[PDB]
Amino acid sequence: GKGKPRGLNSARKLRVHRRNNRWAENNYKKRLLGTAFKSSPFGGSSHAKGIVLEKLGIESKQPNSAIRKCVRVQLIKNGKKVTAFVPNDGCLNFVDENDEVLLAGFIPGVRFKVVKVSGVSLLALWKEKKEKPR
Amino acid sequence: EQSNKQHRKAKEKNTAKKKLHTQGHNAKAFAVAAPGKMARTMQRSSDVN
RNA sequence: GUCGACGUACUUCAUAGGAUCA
RNA sequence: UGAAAUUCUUGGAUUUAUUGAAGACUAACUACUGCGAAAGCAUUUGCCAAGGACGUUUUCAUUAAUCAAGAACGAAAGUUAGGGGAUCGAAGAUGAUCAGAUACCGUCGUAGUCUUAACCAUAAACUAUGCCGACUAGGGAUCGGGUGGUGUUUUUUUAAUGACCCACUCGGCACCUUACGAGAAAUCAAAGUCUUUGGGUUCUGGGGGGAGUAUGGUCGCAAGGCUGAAGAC
RNA sequence: UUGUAAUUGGAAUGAGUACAAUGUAAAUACCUUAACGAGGAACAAUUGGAGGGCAAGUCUGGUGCCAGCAGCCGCGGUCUCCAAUAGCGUAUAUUGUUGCAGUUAAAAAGCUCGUAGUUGAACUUUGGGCCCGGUU
RNA sequence: GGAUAGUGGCCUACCAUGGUUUCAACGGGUAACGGGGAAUAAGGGUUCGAUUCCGGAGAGGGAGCCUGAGAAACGGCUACCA
Ligand SMILES: [Mg+2]
Ligand SMILES: [Mg+2]
Ligand SMILES: [Mg+2]
Ligand SMILES: [Mg+2]
Ligand SMILES: [Mg+2]
Ligand SMILES: [Mg+2]
Ligand SMILES: [Mg+2]
Ligand SMILES: [Mg+2]
Ligand SMILES: [Mg+2]
Ligand SMILES: [Mg+2]
Ligand SMILES: [Mg+2]
Ligand SMILES: [Mg+2]
Ligand SMILES: [Mg+2]
Ligand SMILES: [Mg+2]
Ligand SMILES: [Mg+2]
Ligand SMILES: [Mg+2]
């Protein structure tokens, strides 16, 4: 005996035992209860819109440093302040205060990067293929 | 130099099957039929929102 | 009110051992 | 006491002896040996019922194993109402606050410790080890019963019993050796059942240890409104 | 005998243009096809990653001449390689019936009784003697 | 007995006290139309299926009807709600 019923007519005890024990899994619990998106950085979304409050590392002396590429952004969905990466200081010129920035998951502690500014791809602006509409 | 072996205390933290009843209601009762469509539909709506 | 408990989500500390050589 | 000091004391303390009273507890014998489902259980004698094991060429014939619901008991502490109140003693008070192996010591001691009628139902409630069934090594010690001997002691009339010695058999707490197997190891006759897995059944877990951070969540959580110091010359 | 060509020769061809015809209800397109249509064949293939080198240049630090960061900015003057390929990149998401474990690091309930549920000893025509037709 | 195209607590009158349930009724959730199917997996399984076919329901929300063999129809009608 393994501590589990084995009789040919004991199907029900096995099913009811399984259904009760399946809730132990954190993955299972999150999936059915729809709580798997609390841990998501954006609260379930793949991208986040934000307002550029300030360019923190604008005054850093060393060019192209990690600090120079960080911007403090307000998430419009909830108003929480977060920090985002820009691909390079050259791209930082495009970003200025009080524009919409679309953020995506990525100086430890910075977990976001800017992918679109003012509704235009930041990569496109860097490649000189578009103009930022103001 | 005498180091006694720790007494691993019996759990007082709520078990995984007990945590589900700590809130106001029984969390297991309020669950959807097809969680697969929950995750897919919810993610799309979040970006639309 | 930088209040308590719980739930949830994350961070963090504990990894070196044998042989040869100088 | 490390030394003191609260304390008692020429109205005689401490100590001696002859008693008397009160309430607990059953030393040494005492051993993880014995009994009980466990928690637990130890002075003598009586009564009441209960129980394992052993013996049976007695009796019924599947009446059985496990167990959600439900029920009885459940160490110590604790609550309600009486009784009792010796010792010890949470709390409280008080002496001293000098010295680090003796660094937490002393005195008074409320509740409790005991008991009666109900509650509370928690322990490292431990073999940190579910229950029933089968099988898989040798060895001698013990507890209860039973069988056997032309064995010792005893009955000091015999004897028969009782107590011992030896062999074995059932059941039990157990213990040594074991390249039998298992395990990383400690170790285990079960934590074993020839490489990876099925004799029956109940319960539990989905990861541990030591630190933190935040919280669109849940349940909770105060007081305050007439009060005013100044050695040098 | 290896690599590099804004070197060089004449052969081929469709993207595109277009008589015509086919196609279609009428058209467009396809398949056909006179005539044009290639050397930077400029008729100008992309998406990602990795690694350099350069200055009378700039910043920072120090056991001198150095090291780190990095370098579209200097006195005047108006580069290499790797992967996929008409496709490539980024972000989020993405329990054991067979077959788990419970002494020493998750988890055996303090003990017993007990309903449902699951499971539950053995035994009843076995053996023997012939006949037929099938396969390999 | 009435009604129905018709069986039937479908409804009416009188009667009895029945019916389901730990073999999970009743109640709650369902980002629940159901199926043929789709994905993955070595096998068991796990998930998806509004969506080319079949069947059901609806035409902003309830309620009620004429016509007609066939409708509680809505590119038919009437009220109420918005
Ligand atoms: Mg077994
Ligand atoms: Mg005894
Ligand atoms: Mg009392
Ligand atoms: Mg009780
Ligand atoms: Mg004990
Ligand atoms: Mg056994
Ligand atoms: Mg075309
Ligand atoms: Mg039964
Ligand atoms: Mg049988
Ligand atoms: Mg629906
Ligand atoms: Mg579905
Ligand atoms: Mg469908
Ligand atoms: Mg309709
Ligand atoms: Mg509409
Ligand atoms: Mg209608
Ligand atoms: Mg219509």
Curated annotation (Swiss-Prot), chain A:
Present with 10600 molecules/cell in log phase SD medium. GO terms for cellular component: cytosol; cytosolic small ribosomal subunit; ribosome. This is Small ribosomal subunit protein uS12A. It is found in: Cytoplasm. The modification 3,4-dihydroxyproline is found at P63. It comes from Saccharomyces cerevisiae (strain ATCC 204508 / S288c) (Baker's yeast). Keywords: Cytoplasm, Hydroxylation, Isopeptide bond, Ribonucleoprotein, Ribosomal protein, Ubl conjugation. Its main location: cytoplasm. CDD domains: Ribosomal_S23. The gene is RPS23A. Component of the small ribosomal subunit (SSU). Mature yeast ribosomes consist of a small (40S) and a large (60S) subunit. The 40S small subunit contains 1 molecule of ribosomal RNA (18S rRNA) and 33 different proteins (encoded by 57 genes). The large 60S subunit contains 3 rRNA molecules (25S, 5.8S and 5S rRNA) and 46 different proteins (encoded by 81 genes). Hydroxylation at Pro-63 affects translation termination efficiency. The stereochemistry of the 3,4-dihydroxyproline has not yet been determined.
From Swiss-Prot, chain B:
Residues 1-22 have a biased composition (Basic residues). Residues 1-38 are annotated as: Disordered. It comes from the Eukaryota. It is found in: Cytoplasm; Nucleus, Nucleolus. GTPase required for synthesis of 40S ribosomal subunits and for processing the 35S pre-rRNA at sites A0, A1, and A2. Controls access of pre-ribosomal RNA intermediates to RCL1 during ribosome biogenesis by binding of RCL1 in a GTP-dependent manner and, via its affinity to U3 snoRNA, delivering it to pre-ribosomes. GTP-binding and/or GTP hydrolysis may induce conformational rearrangements within the BMS1-RCL1 complex allowing the interaction of RCL1 with its RNA substrate. Required for RCL1 import into the nucleus. Belongs to the TRAFAC class translation factor GTPase superfamily. Bms1-like GTPase family. BMS1 subfamily. Interacts directly with RCL1 and the U3 snoRNA to form a stable subcomplex. Component of the 90S small subunit processome also known as 90S pre-ribosome that consists of the 35S pre-rRNA, early-associating ribosomal proteins most of which are part of the small ribosomal subunit, the U3 snoRNA and associated proteins. This is Ribosome biogenesis protein BMS1. It comes from Saccharomyces cerevisiae (strain ATCC 204508 / S288c) (Baker's yeast). The chain holds residues 2 to 50 of 1183 of the full protein.
